[PDB]
Amino acid sequence: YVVGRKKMMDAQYKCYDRMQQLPAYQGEGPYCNRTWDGWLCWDDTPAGVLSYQFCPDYFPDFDPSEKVTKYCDEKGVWFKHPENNRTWSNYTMCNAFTPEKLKNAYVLYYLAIVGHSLSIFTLVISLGIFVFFRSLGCQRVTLHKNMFLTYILNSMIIIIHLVEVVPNGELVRRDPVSCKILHFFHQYMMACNYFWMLCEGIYLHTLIVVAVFTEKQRLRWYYLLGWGFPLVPTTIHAITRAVYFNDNCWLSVETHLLYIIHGPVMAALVVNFFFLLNIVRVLVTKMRETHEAESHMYLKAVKATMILVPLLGIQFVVFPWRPSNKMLGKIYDYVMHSLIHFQGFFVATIYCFCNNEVQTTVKRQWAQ
Amino acid sequence: XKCNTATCATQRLAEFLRHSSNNFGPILPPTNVGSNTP
Amino acid sequence: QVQLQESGGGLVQPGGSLRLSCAASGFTFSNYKMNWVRQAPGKGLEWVSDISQSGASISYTGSVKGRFTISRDNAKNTLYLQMNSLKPEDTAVYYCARCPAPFTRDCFDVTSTTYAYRGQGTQVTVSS
Amino acid sequence: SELDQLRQEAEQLKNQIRDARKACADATLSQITNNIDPVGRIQMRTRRTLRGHLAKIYAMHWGTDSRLLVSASQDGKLIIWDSYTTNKVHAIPLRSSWVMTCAYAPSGNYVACGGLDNICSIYNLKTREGNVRVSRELAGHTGYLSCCRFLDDNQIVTSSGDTTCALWDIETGQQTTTFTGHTGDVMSLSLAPDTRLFVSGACDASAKLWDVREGMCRQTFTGHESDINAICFFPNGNAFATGSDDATCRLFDLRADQELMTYSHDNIICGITSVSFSKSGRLLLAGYDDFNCNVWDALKADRAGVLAGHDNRVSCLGVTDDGMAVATGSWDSFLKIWN
Amino acid sequence: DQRNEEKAQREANKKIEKQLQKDKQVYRATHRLLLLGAGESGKNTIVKQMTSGIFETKFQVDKVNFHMFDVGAQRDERRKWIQCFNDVTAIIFVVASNRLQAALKLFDSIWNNKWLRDTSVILFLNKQDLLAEKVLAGKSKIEDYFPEFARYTTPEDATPEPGEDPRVTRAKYFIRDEFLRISTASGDGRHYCYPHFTCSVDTENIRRVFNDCRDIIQRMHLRQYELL
Amino acid sequence: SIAQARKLVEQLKMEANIDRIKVSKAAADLMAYCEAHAKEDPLLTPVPASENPFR
Ligand SMILES: CCCCCCCCCCCCCCCCC[C@H](O)OC[C@@H](COP(=O)([O-])OCC[N+](C)(C)C)O[C@@H](O)CCCCCCCCCCCCCCC
């Protein structure tokens, strides 16, 4: 609470220092004079319009993503609440939906934990299988193993963050450098996971679309891209946050500085999307050359896309817009989180348990 | 500017749980936005 | 010892018919594919027809598709070829040939100049 | 015509031979050994996995020391292994990559190999410069080389797809004897313990016993239904076993001049690629197209064990002169030592 | 001592492992092709356009190594030595457009052999010009050797060359569909057949092989990812 | 040809004039040899560990 009041007084001082170099009303007609309600602070406005701005975080139940509303009447005066006839601002929406949103957030939290635990277990099994069977080993398997390891590390870090850092507010209040190191590791591992998805995309596109003939790839560049490059943007973001937007243990997502990391990830995933499109085009042309049945062609080119989506992380590219409608937004949140947290499990199941070679080798070994 | 990309979904969820929830504890009564409040 | 002994054949007038037989011994007759081949005078060996292990799959060369009929009797270890509407071009030595290996889909080398799993053919002469 | 008389007379002699063999068969081997105790389940384990060949393996041969062995792969390479340590000793590039057989000289000084080039290439391992260079190239076969075995450092017997076997005098390049009489591709040969005789299996379903010095076929054995792919002498030299594409292995007695036992099973439907006896001859080991190797009780015809460690067809196998282990090669490019 | 012997054996093994690593680079980067003929097919003339039992001819297309092998001094009985070529990129089958029926039985054996089931076949229906003049004259007919030719019609997917009379177009397409019937009856996604109407001297033959091999390798890659 | 039939007949005569023993006698000798060398067969009688060079 005291923190919220302190932020309220800081905002009060901020827009008290505001109004410097007072302008002159432009246009014509009566205008509403600038005022400070007590929580937010409005600028010059003309008569007969509704102003908006994001809700403050003074209170725990206030949703910042909501929009505050303030109307200046056509007579030049602000909204006067009918009940008491005093200047009033609409802050109801700031916390109207908070209870149901928190109720859904609990389910999302448990869903993420379950998905990452299952992913960890299945991916550990798959990695053990791949290491165990030397015959299954190959350049595709060599990259698959790195992807599995990055998935496992990311899932473990996410589980630890969700279970020990998010619910332990006293630790964050202390603000030790330990969770700063933890956040650095988490960001680095997330970037490594995305860039290994990109590495998989690049190798698959370079095996089927271009340079198919006699192509043996040098894995060194794949190791450099997957493991090495993600360290540059992470370091730059860490420096910038330690310079410009240092906050308690670097847990805030309200800084435009997170784009330093996420931007390049988005570009890599878009490149992976284009790779997927080209690969599907090549597959469709291959089926066409054989005069494959149209229904079989569509079924096979849909199965290929569905199995490629988890590998290349396409769900991070085709879910940009969350619908405003509450039901549609809830469905979007559920679908996106289910796809994200369970991606490792999907990859392990598709590329290890459903692989014909893996099944055949396991069955032949099972004799003894 | 906030990071609104899908990659930031989990971070945003964790931040909202940390902020709105009372450390994953008991529920509090809602703040007042009535006619007497600003 | 693998043995194939063809019988039948001989001089027949044009437009006639014949019934060739192949008696097999020394191997499990019921799990091998069989073939009829012939060697016209002053010519190489030519494939005629074949029959699967159970007799379901049958094939003929173009020149005898509707004229010849190949059959087998597994219980008696015998192979048959019914030749009808014989014309002078059919004159040749006809050999009963077994595919090299059992339970096999392909059938290699049955028409080679020297092949072990082939009997001493029976002369078939179509002339006036 | 004279052709019919010769054909008719030949049939008369075959009946006589069959009658003579039928008279000697007063009791079968199965009932002679009915009262002896079973061998019992014999379980062997993979003790070594030899890696390094790039392509499918076609042949291997133990050295006389029971430690070193040579393997031939169609990648165009001959590799000599040390089975105890798994270390590679020699990697010999080959002019032609389509090798089909290899042999280790009993002295350990030479190795031989051949294939689709129709040439038997001998390599001197103990050259004065330490490197391995081709010493002699034996030409004269009109077909691919299928098998070869050193008699000594200057003599080698070969088998060829040209349906003939040849005896060569190394360091002159000429074959001093040609063993004719087979009608199909000769696929495998085995030298007798005394080296005075050897037996060959061909693609005509027959095996022939040859006299090395005289150069004539002494006996012919029948009973298989398809191509003979492997042949091996019994330890005492009075019998031999063969593997065929008909999915069966058979034991033949030289003195009885007829077959003694058939090793087969209803579930075995693939062809046999190799065969070998144990030190005492009680066990008969055979490789199979179905990636497995079966261990047979030679005396009782019972199956006593299985070796299943390969992911592709087993192409060759052998038992060390000391009988302490058995090696198996596969198209999967790996060699395994079982004990 | 023994520790010196084991040390020497490790150095000897290490050195051989180095050469094999480089040996695997050349082998993996070169495509092996088996050249096969049904008899008087004209493959010798094609080879000219780029005791010894095997002949070799190495050629380069777009920096890509190709290694083609022709059998010599080998008996007509192929059931044994044909198994050696179970791992080549493709088998080139040259045929002169009753040798044709013989060539068909040999192709069916190759297509349906258990060891050759995963191996692709590039089919060169050779000597189109020779078939043209024989077809135009009409002194010889395909009906005598293949009675089904009477009821055959030129496919609607046919692309006859400019100036090709309809009679010759049907003849060459009828022969092509003879091989395609065998190939499509089996080979469930494991191997494929690439027919080509070719002349023994045309310069485009090596380009055709290069394009067919690329499709074969592309399909192998797609099958390893279980996409196709 | 006619030469092959004569060569085949000559070979068949050689194979028909050999002396054969009873199968029972041949089987007994094979049984005796296996019984005599049974104790020396590592693959038949397993050898204790530390006694085989492939342990
Ligand atoms: C190739 C095949 C593809 C298959 C893909 C999918 C395969 C696996 C599917 C698994 C589906 C996910 C699991 C079920 C749904 C997610 C968990 C669910 O939401 O948890 C119910 C939870 C709801 O939260 P709330 O009640 O609103 O919050 C209460 C809040 N308040 C605590 C403050 C009161 O109920 C919980 O409260 C009860 C406590 C435990 C809930 C489940 C989590 C248990 C712990 C998980 C540990 C990891 C398990 C891994 C299993 C793999």
Q: What is the DSSP string of D12-75?
A: HHHHHHHHHHHHH-SS-HHHHTTTSPP-------EEEEE---SS-EEEEEE-TTSSEEEEEETT
Mutate-to-test residue for ligand 1 from A101, A114, A338, A340, highest number of ligand atoms within 8 A of CB: A114
Phi-psi region of D301 (alpha: psi -120 to 50; beta: other; left: phi over 0): left
E in contact with D (at least 3 C-beta pairs within 8 A): yes
| Contact in structure between D277 and D232 (CB atoms under 8 Å) | yes
In terms of residues, how long is chain A? 368
Q: Does A359 touch chain B (CB under 8 A)?
A: no
Please tell me whether residue D247 adopts helix, strand or coil conformation: coil
Assess D203–C contact: CB distance below 8 Å, yes or no.
yes
Q: Quote the CA–CA distance of A53 and A232 in Å, as a whole number.
A: 35
Question: Which chains neighbour A (Cβ–Cβ under 8 Å, 3 or more pairs)?
Answer: B, D, E
Strand D155-160 vs strand D145-152: parallel, antiparallel, or unpaired? antiparallel
User: Which stretches within A133-176 are classed as H helix?
Assistant: 139-160, 169-174
Determine the distance in angstroms separating the CA of A207 from the nearest CA of chain E, rounded to an integer: 7
Closest Cα in chain C to E108: C106
Instruction: Give the CATH number of the domain where residue C39 resides.
Output: 2.60.40.10
Strand order in the sheet with D68-73: D57-62, D68-73, D77-82, D88-93
Using CA atoms, how far residue C51 sits from C22, C58, C82, C101, D115, in Å, is 13, 5, 13, 14, 35
Residue in the structure block whose two tokens are 């800084």: A255
Answer yes or no: do C46 and E98 touch at CB < 8 A: yes
Asked if A158 and A112 touch (Cβ cutoff 8 Å), the reply is yes
Q: After which residues is chain C broken (C to N over 2.5 A)?
A: none
From the number of C-beta atoms within 10 Å of its C-beta (0-12, 13-18, 19+), residue E140 rates as exposed
Q: Per the CB < 8 Å rule, is E217 touching A213?
A: yes
CB burial class (10 A; 0-12, 13-18, 19+) of residue A212?
Answer: buried
How many residues are given for chain B?
38
Determine B/A contact with 3+ CB pairs under 8 A as the test.
Answer: yes
Query: What range does the domain containing F18 cover?
Result: 2-54
Tell me whether residues E16 and D88 touch, CB distance under 8 A. yes
Closest CB to D311: pick one of A364, A367, A368: A364
Task: Name the residue facing C108 among E79, E147, E148 (closest C-beta).
Answer: E79
- How far apart, in Å, are the Cα atoms of A98 and each of A92, A305, A328, D120? 11, 38, 17, 87
**Where do the structural domains in chain D lie, given as residue ranges?**
2-339
d(CA E208, CA E189): 22
Contact residues on chain A for B32, CB-CB shorter than 8 A: none
Cα distance between residue A238 and residue A177, in whole Å? 13
How far, in Å, CA of A116 to CA of A344, rounded? 8
Does CATH number 2.130.10.10 belong to domain D2-339? yes
**Record: contact C63-E145, CB cut-off 8 A:** yes
Q: Domain coordinates of chain A in residue numbers?
A: 2-94, 98-365
Q: Cα(A102) to centroid of ligand 1, in Å?
A: 15
Residues 6+ apart with CB under 8 A from C64: C48, C49, C83, C90
A98-365 maps to CATH 3.30.460.10? no
Do residue B13 and residue A95 have CB atoms under 8 angstroms apart? no
Tokens 């046999």 locate to D272
Torsion angles phi and psi, residue D278, rounded to 5: -85, 175
Whether the CB-CB separation of D337 and D47 falls below 8 Å is answered with yes
> Is the Cβ–Cβ distance between D325 and D47 less than 8 Å?
yes
Rounded CA-CA distance E117/E189 in Å is 10
* Residue from the list E25, E215, E221 with its beta carbon closest to the beta carbon of A207: E221
CB-nearest to E218 from A212, A308, A354 is A212
Q: Do E98 and C109 touch (CB under 8 A)?
A: no
A368 vs chain D: nearest CA distance in angstroms?
Answer: 9
Q: Between chains, do B9 and A337 touch, taking CB under 8 Å as contact?
A: yes
Torsion over CA: C103, C104, C109, C111 (sign)? positive
As beta bridge partners, residue C6 has C22
Position C89: which residue type?
E
Report the alpha-carbon distance of residue A276 to residue A112 in Å, rounded. 27
At position D247, the amino acid (one-letter code) is A
Report the gap between the CA of B22 and the closest CA in chain A (Å): 8
Distance (angstroms) between ligand 1 centre and the Cα of A108 equals 8
Asked whether the beta carbons of residue E65 and residue A307 sit closer than 8 angstroms, the reply is: no
CB contact burial A171-188 (16+ within 10 A = b; e otherwise): ebeeeeeebbebbeebbb
Q: Report which secondary-structure segment, H or E, holds A308.
A: helix A294-312
Cβ-contact D282, F36 below 8 angstroms:
no
Give the span between the Cα atoms of B36 and A88, in whole angstroms.
Answer: 8
Let me know how long chain C is.
128
Instruction: Give the count of Cβ contacts less than 8 A between chain A and E.
Output: 48
**Cα distance between residue E204 and residue B32, in whole Å:** 84
Method: cryo-EM
> Distance between CA atoms of E21 and D54, rounded to whole angstroms?
10
Contacts with A368 (C-beta within 8 Å, 6 or more apart), sequence order: D308
Q: Which two tokens stand for residue E101?
A: 């029926």
Q: What DSSP designation does E215 have?
A: H
List D242's β-bridge partners, or say none.
Answer: D231, D250
Domain made up of A2-94: CATH architecture: Irregular (4.10)
- Residue A13 CB contacts under 8 Å (≥ 6 apart), including other chains: none
Structure token pair of residue A181: 């190191």
D touches A, CB cut-off 8 Å, minimum 3 pairs: yes
Spell out the residues 6+ positions from residue A140 whose beta carbon is closer than 8 angstroms to its own: A203, E224, E225
Residue list, ligand 1 pocket, CB within 6 Å:
A 103, 106-107, 110-111, 113-114, 117-118, 342, 349; B 24
D308 — contact with chain A (CB < 8 Å)?
yes
What does the alpha-carbon distance between residue D12 and residue F9 come to, in Å, rounded to a whole number?
A: 10
Q: How far is CA B15 from CA A6, A146, A253, B20, D123, in A?
A: 20, 30, 8, 9, 75
Distance in Å, alpha carbon of D118 to nearest chain F alpha carbon: 26
Interface test with E, best of A141, A212, A278, A288 (most E CBs within 10 A): A212
D66-94: b (≥16 Cβ within 10 Å) or e: bbbbbbbbbbbbbbbbbbeebbbbbbbeb
A126 to chain D, closest Cα gap in Å:
21
Count the neighbouring beta carbons within 10 Å of the beta carbon of residue A29. Answer: 11
Residues of E in contact with D91 (CB under 8 A): 16, 19-20
* Chain A residues within an 8 Å CB radius of E192: 290
CA torsion A104→A107→A109→A111, rounded to 10°?
Answer: -140
Domain hosting C24: range is 1-128
Of D260, D20, D167, D236, which is closest to residue F15 (Cα–Cα)?
D20
| Candidate from C62, C66, C109 with C-beta closest to E78 | C109
CA distance A345 to A151: 9
Number of domains in chain C: 1
User: Strands E90-96 and E30-37: what pairing?
Assistant: parallel
D225 contact residues in C (CB cutoff 8 A) = 2, 26-28, 102
Hey, what are A236's tokens? 């730059």
Question: For residue A67, what are its two tokens?
Answer: 């929009």
**A332 vs B: CB within 8 A:** no
Q: Of F27, F29, F33, which Cα lies nearest the Cα of D279? A: F33
Integer CA distances (angstroms), F38 to B21, D317, E58, E60, F34, in order: 81, 22, 56, 61, 6
Number of domains in chain F: 1
Query: Is chain C adjacent to chain E, meaning 3+ CB pairs within 8 angstroms?
Result: yes
Show Cβ contacts of residue D191 under 8 Å, excluding neighbours closer than 6 positions: D149, D151, D157, D198, D233
CB-closest option in B7, B11, B23 to A316: B7
Would you call A348 exposed, middle or buried from its count of C-beta atoms within 10 A (0-12, 13-18, 19+)? buried
Cα three-residue angle D239-D245-D249, rounded to 5 degrees: 30
Angle between helices A259-289 and A231-243 (to 10 degrees): 150
Q: Which whole-number Å values give the CA distances from A213 to A146, A186, E93, E219, in the listed order?
A: 25, 39, 22, 11
Which among C18, C12, C1, C13 is positioned nearest to C82, based on CA atoms?
C18
Neighboring chain C residues of D183 at a CB cutoff of 8 Å: 114, 116
Rounded-to-10 torsion of CA A344, A350, A351, A353:
100
Superfamily of domain E30-224: P-loop containing nucleotide triphosphate hydrolases (3.40.50.300)
Three-state DSSP class for residue A87: strand
CATH assignment of the domain containing F42: 4.10.260.10
- C125 contacts: CB under 8 Å, gap ≥ 6: C10, C11, C12, C91
State which H helix or E strand residue E179 sits in.
helix E166-185
Residue A112 Cα, ligand 1 centroid: separation in angstroms?
A: 8
Structure tokens at D274: 């190799």
Under DSSP, is residue E44 helix (H, G, I), strand (E, B) or coil? Answer: helix
Instruction: Please state, in angstroms and rounded to a whole number, the distance separating the CA atoms of residues A222 and E167.
Output: 57
Distance CA A303, CA A309 (A): 10
Which atom of ligand 1 is least distant from the CA of A111? 16
Eight-state DSSP code of residue D332: T
Closest CA to C90 of C42, C125, C48, C50: C125
CA of A345 to the centre of ligand 1 (A): 15
- Give every CB contact of residue E113 below 8 A, 6+ residues apart in sequence: C106, C108, E82, E83
